[PDB]
Design a protein around this ligand. Sequence first.
Ligand SMILES: [Mg+2]
Ligand SMILES: [Mg+2]
Length: 59
Amino acid sequence: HVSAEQILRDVYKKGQKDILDLEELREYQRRKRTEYEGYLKRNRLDMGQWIRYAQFEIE
RNA sequence: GUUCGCGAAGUAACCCUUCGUGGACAUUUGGUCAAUUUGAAACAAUACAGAGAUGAUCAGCAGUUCCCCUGCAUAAGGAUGAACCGUUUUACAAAGAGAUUU
Ligand SMILES: [Mg+2]
Ligand SMILES: [Mg+2]
């Protein structure tokens, strides 16, 4: 039987569906810092991004 | 080189030369910069696509940015010039209940 809730359950179920040396580490680091410094040069605010980027440098 | 002397020598006679000699005049340019590759413009060609809020096709104005280009520009253009679309955990406590230990 067809109702709107069963349509939206169908839509929800539809849309729901190796560092080995130091140079690979430096590339991972350079790429991630370009990411975070980009999203912080654009939005100077948003302290949560600052805490995540600081936790990244802790890791 | 010029000029004022001061001596000698040639003719001298008060001039004119050769020569030595004291003074005067005139007195510090240019480089931030070496002459083809190795101290720094850049575009353009072959290949792929064929422009944002869309169900489709479009008008735009902004904003933020350690991106700028054309412009005489504080005007206006550059796809509304473009990038924007991701990753997301703790100022962490109170009352009650069920098991372990003392
Ligand atoms: Mg714009
Ligand atoms: Mg504009």
